């Protein structure tokens, strides 16, 4: 791979991050990708 994923501490979904990227707690709202910046967006498959 290797694709980095981070887990949102509010909704528990896993979100892809860019290679080479963090706060103790992370939330969808902090996503650099605006497409996955809301907890309502479904989790991407592996």
């Amino acid at each position: 791979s290797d694709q980095t994923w981070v887990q949102c501490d509010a909704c528990l979904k896993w979100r892809k991050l860019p290679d080479g990227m963090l706060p103790e707690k992370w939330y969808c709202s902090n996503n650099p990708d605006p497409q996955f910046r809301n907890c309502e967006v479904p989790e991407e498959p592996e």
Binding site: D2, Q3, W5, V6, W14, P23, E46
Partner: peptide, 8 residues
């Protein structure tokens, strides 16, 4: 943050 790597 909690992170994991998958083999893309």
């Amino acid at each position: 943050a909690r992170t994991k790597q998958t083999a893309r």
